[PDB]
Design a protein around this ligand. Structure first.
Ligand SMILES: O=c1ccn([C@@H]2O[C@H](COP(=O)(O)OP(=O)(O)O)[C@@H](O)[C@H]2O)c(=O)[nH]1
Length: 333
């Protein structure tokens, strides 16, 4: 049984960009499952083989991720593949999709059936997002994002000195989460830092007025996110509208593993699936401020909440074998 992983829109070579790093970490976890796997990309190197040096059909299972040469090559490669394509649906804004003088569609048209492995539990949302796909398509839920906590070298963050009140790391996401970012992170009167690719100048929509913004700092490597989260008393979990009561995102685990107390927007998880404890949830800005002040003022509460969230994380890690079994079942092995 031979498996190939391709990133449909980004080049994979090193840990320099985020889309390249998650493909390599996905590749690492699948390898640690005891599977023979290769990443196919633009060039040959320590982590990859080139599209030109392999025969797509030598692979029994083709896994496709997403996060222009990379886009044109992957399509030509997939267009020649004669079996089912397993698409990892990890971001609502990136459903599977078919992308001029240099191109013929008989060379780029993908006719294979596609199995969408949705990171969100609500398959109707995944189906609605893939409405335009002409292909034969099937859907299945798999919590792909747990890959980080199941890696062999995973470890919780240690207690660290606090220099911030609340931290959130991420990008602007085309303004898809602007109302939520402004509500929980702007005008709080607290010491907040927003790290990642966002900038203050992007927050320009007149519908969400604000006076003072959080401090914006640059991006950091994926493997340093929990350590960065750890410099704060609390770290925020918010999501796009279609992630609510649907997607558990990577930040949930990155935060849970950190030394920062995880504070979750109520609307993201109304049933309280993540942690069945109301102390970890906030409905709005007023509640976030009060919760952060309670945590800054009672070490007994902060330590208890950290202890509880680390316990939930360890409980989940304890099921690594079942998680690995389900992933193999999802890819028909
Ligand atoms: O400086 C940074 C900021 C974010 N991230 C990664 O980007 C993810 C956030 O992605 P996004 O902003 O799209 O938000 P999501 O939809 O995952 O909540 C984080 O979980 C990190 O893994 C990173 O590696 N470096």
């Amino acid at each position: 049984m031979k498996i190939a992983i391709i990133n449909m829109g980004n080049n994979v070579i090193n840990f320099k960009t985020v889309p390249s790093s998650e493909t390599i970490y996905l590749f690492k976890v699948i390898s640690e499952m005891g599977l023979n796997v290769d990443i196919i990309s633009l060039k040959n190197g320590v982590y990859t083989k080139s599209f030109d040096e392999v025969d797509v059909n030598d692979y029994d299972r083709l896994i496709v991720v997403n996060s222009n040469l990379a886009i044109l090559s992957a399509q030509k490669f997939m267009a020649k593949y004669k079996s089912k394509i397993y698409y990892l649906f990890t971001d609502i804004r990136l459903p599977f999709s078919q992308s001029a003088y240099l191109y013929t569609e008989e060379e780029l048209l993908i006719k294979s059936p596609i199995k969408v492995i949705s990171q969100g539990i609500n398959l109707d949302i995944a189906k609605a997002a893939h409405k335009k796909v002409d292909n034969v398509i099937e859907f299945e839920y798999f919590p792909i994002e747990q890959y980080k906590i199941h890696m062999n070298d995973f470890q919780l963050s240690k207690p660290t000195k606090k220099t911030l009140d609340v931290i959130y790391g991420g990008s602007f996401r085309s303004g898809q989460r602007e109302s939520k970012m402004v509500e929980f992170l702007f005008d709080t009167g607290l010491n907040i830092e927003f790290f990642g690719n966002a900038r203050e100048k992007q927050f320009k929509n007149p519908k969400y007025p604000w006076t003072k913004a959080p401090v914006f700092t640059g991006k950091i490597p994926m493997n340093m996110v929990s350590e960065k989260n750890s410099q704060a008393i609390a770290a925020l979990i918010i999501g796009d509208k279609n992630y609510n009561d649907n997607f558990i995102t990577l930040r949930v685990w990155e935060t849970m593993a950190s030394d920062a107390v995880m504070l979750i927007d109520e609307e993201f998880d109304t049933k309280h699936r993540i942690i069945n404890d109301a102390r970890f949830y906030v409905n709005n800005r007023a509640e976030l401020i009060d919760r952060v002040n309670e945590l800054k003022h009672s070490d007994v509460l902060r330590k208890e909440m950290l202890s509880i969230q680390h316990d939930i994380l360890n409980k989940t890690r304890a099921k690594k074998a079942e998680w690995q079994d389900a992933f193999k079942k999802a890819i028909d092995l």
